[PDB]
Amino acid sequence: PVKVCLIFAGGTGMNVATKLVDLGEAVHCFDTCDKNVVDVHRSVNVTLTKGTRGNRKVILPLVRPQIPALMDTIPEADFYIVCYSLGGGSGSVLGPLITGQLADRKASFVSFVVGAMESTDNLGNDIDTMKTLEAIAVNKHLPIVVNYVPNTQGRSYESINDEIAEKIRKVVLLVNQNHGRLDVHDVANWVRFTDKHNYLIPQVCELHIETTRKDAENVPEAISQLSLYLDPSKEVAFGTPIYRKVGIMKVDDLDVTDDQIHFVINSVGVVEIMKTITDSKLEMTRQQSKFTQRNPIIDADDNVDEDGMVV
Amino acid sequence: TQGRSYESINDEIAEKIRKVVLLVNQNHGRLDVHDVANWVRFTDKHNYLIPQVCELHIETTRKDAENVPEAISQLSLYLDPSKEVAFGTPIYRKVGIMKVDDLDVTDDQIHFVINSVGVVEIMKTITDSKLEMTRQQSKFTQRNPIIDADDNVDEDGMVV
Amino acid sequence: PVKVCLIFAGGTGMNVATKLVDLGEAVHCFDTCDKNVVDVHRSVNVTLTKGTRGNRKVILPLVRPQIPALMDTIPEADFYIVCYSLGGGSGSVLGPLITGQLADRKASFVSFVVGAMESTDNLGNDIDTMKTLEAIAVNKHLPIVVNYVPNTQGRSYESINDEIAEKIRKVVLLVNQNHGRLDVHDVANWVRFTDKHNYLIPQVCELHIETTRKDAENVPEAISQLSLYLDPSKEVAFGTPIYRKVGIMKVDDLDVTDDQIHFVINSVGVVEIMKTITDSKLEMTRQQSKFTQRNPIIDADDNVDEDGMVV
Ligand SMILES: Nc1nc2c(ncn2[C@@H]2O[C@H](COP(=O)(O)OP(=O)(O)O)[C@@H](O)[C@H]2O)c(=O)[nH]1
Ligand SMILES: Nc1nc2c(ncn2[C@@H]2O[C@H](COP(=O)(O)OP(=O)(O)O)[C@@H](O)[C@H]2O)c(=O)[nH]1
Ligand SMILES: [Mg+2]
Numbered sequence A, C: 001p002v003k004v005c006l007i008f009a010g011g012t013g014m015n016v017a018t019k020l021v022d023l024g025e026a027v028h029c030f031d032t033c034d035k036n037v038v039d040v041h042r043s044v045n046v047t048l049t050k051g052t053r054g055n056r057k058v059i060l061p062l063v064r065p066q067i068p069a070l071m072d073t074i075p076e077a078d079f080y081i082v083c084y085s086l087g088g089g090s091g092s093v094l095g096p097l098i099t100g101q102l103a104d105r106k107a108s109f110v111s112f113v114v115g116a117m118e119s120t121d122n123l124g125n126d127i128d129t130m131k132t133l134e135a136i137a138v139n140k141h142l143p144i145v146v147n148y149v150p151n152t153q154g155r156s157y158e159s160i161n162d163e164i165a166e167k168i169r170k171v172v173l174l175v176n177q178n179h180g181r182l183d184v185h186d187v188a189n190w191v192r193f194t195d196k197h198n199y200l201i202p203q204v205c206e207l208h209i210e211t212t213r214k215d216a217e218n219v220p221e222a223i224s225q226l227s228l229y230l231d232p233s234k235e236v237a238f239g240t241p242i243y244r245k246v247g248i249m250k251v252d253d254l255d256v257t258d259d260q261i262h263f264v265i266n267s268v269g270v271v272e273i274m275k276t277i278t279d280s281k282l283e284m285t286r287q288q289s290k291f292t293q294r295n296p297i298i299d300a301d302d303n304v305d306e307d308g309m310v311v
Numbered sequence B: 001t002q003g004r005s006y007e008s009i010n011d012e013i014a015e016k017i018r019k020v021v022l023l024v025n026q027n028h029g030r031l032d033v034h035d036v037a038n039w040v041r042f043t044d045k046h047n048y049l050i051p052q053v054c055e056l057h058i059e060t061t062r063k064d065a066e067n068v069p070e071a072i073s074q075l076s077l078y079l080d081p082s083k084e085v086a087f088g089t090p091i092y093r094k095v096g097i098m099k100v101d102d103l104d105v106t107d108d109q110i111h112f113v114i115n116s117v118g119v120v121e122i123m124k125t126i127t128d129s130k131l132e133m134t135r136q137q138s139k140f141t142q143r144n145p146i147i148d149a150d151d152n153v154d155e156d157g158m159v160v
């Protein structure tokens, strides 16, 4: 198995992938067409589904039978990262289907998902995709751990994509197997926390990636925590998580970007996130909903034929 | 404590202060200035103990005083010397006999018990309480800026 | 320093000032002409800018170099109150410039600002002036705390001005330094809350001035709270603000108008306010926008000369 396999789906996933092409063979991209394929993608894996050239209900029956074929192109790995938009038609279908397959592999993985906010279609898709991940968490009895990134009004997709790529790199660093005290089994039991803590409920959880003790301590109701420290003198057993582990980073590890990084999983935060999306959409729809069309310009007097022709 | 007036709390504190003023009024049988000093400065003679923040508990029954956990140093005042009972397990213990003509004598017995294995919880309650409150106020999410890179903003932030 | 200095700008500010002339020397008025100067103003300070006899972009370059001169006429004070319309050309420029200068003094102050609603010009100005205050909050790293008063349809400017003057008096009372338990430093740390709470973001905040516990508790996401009580038995530590202080008013204080007054600062309320203005203007513009001029009454046949003369 490789150390980590990175999986990207849909346009948003393709776009984020462009920022991670230096990871090469470890990167696997999937989409239903080539609208988002650019030259830099030659450096990574790209697979497009057949017969599929925004509506998830339409895309699902077309792509479902192809999933096994997609999975054969994804090597066995010690950890996976999955990335896509919750709000489109392709990423939000391919992403969760592949995620279900990773759960069947008994894999350790996290996802980076975008809350798209443009339209009621985006918002509806966001809701259905979050519900999808919840259903998968239940059906596979496994936490589905996601770093949720909302497209906040006024912020460029470029900016958001940059932030996501930088977080993905921290996870790639986390799982690089080069830290003192930190095992592949330690990582597995961090993210698959219900395996050994059977009294906990598998569900959609959030991943919070923080670079200070203060920010990490402020994650509410933390369930499972992993901390990396460059200066082992700064290690402090803070917070109240059920599961906690620490790794010591190496100063000659060129990928070490920060002095300490905390990866905190909780789940009592997704609620609000969803509420904000529902409330925001409601307000927007209310302004556009409150409509009142005018009366028909044609009366029962006009002679209209079967094609609606009035001659 | 939530819901209690500062007036009420202040009244309670003043009444406790008066009991300490009474304690140290130097008019009690058997009780020295040195006895008081060695009660509160207990590490002076008990060098194996650790100086740290300790709590003072001021109780008017044997039962309440006995319920102070891990008592370190204890001073008891009694008006009725027949009621003196050497209770508890403190490291240091002293008794004074109050005088019935002492007009400041408010209670029949008063126990001043010092311990330190109680401050912890107190702090925890404050940290936990604040955390919960902050969590409700923290979980915030501001909206996007109402100004875009399109607007011409000058050094004072003026948009004309 | 004086206890409080009151600053009024533009026509609306001048108009509100007329109701506060009893405060005399403490009142300082500024405008670009004398259209709003009346006899009662003799009782207060009035300064008119030079060479300036509705368009903020036009007024700004004229008045900017004069600000230092205006500031020299404003005494050092322990607290300031600033008042102007967001929707005109003069108040909405002088007001924020002076506000910026007060921030440079490291001053404690609040503003009373009017949301003007007559026209798309008013509404555009309202938006740009709110954005101005936000930019100032950021640039000076200080909350810019305003009591926002919209000119609601059908309500007289007289009525609105009366309400503003009565609120200003409550703030004058608040900062009169005659209350038990309440310091000048307490007031400063209430309104300049980011000074000691560095994890908070300086931005435009609203000031809510309420005379019941119930109304004050209903301010959403309260940040910083100051309560005055005449009956100290009624003091209740309600709400969830980050900062809270109480003062006890004196029954022989002739300025004591109410039994309890709560001054609550939040910021998750300005949004809606702005939305209402944008939505309202949009609807109005839509009705006036949907226009369709007629064809030119002149054809390429007419002999038109350089001055457009057809002889
Ligand atoms: N953060 C981010 N959001 C995007 C990007 N592209 C599109 N979006 C948002 O995500 C939604 C789904 O787009 P996309 O991922 O291309 O859809 P899909 O190809 O059907 O999976 C769009 O409607 C946008 O709101 C991107 O590059 N970054
Ligand atoms: N509440 C209130 N609003 C006013 C008053 N006078 C004008 N307005 C509104 O505020 C806008 C700006 O007027 P004004 O303050 O005189 O403009 P400025 O002198 O250029 O600052 C007007 O277009 C009106 O909509 C007033 O006395 N009270
Ligand atoms: Mg697409």
Ligand SMILES: [Mg+2]
Pocket (backbone or CB within 6 Å): C010, C011, C035, C088, C090
């Ligand atoms: Mg004017």
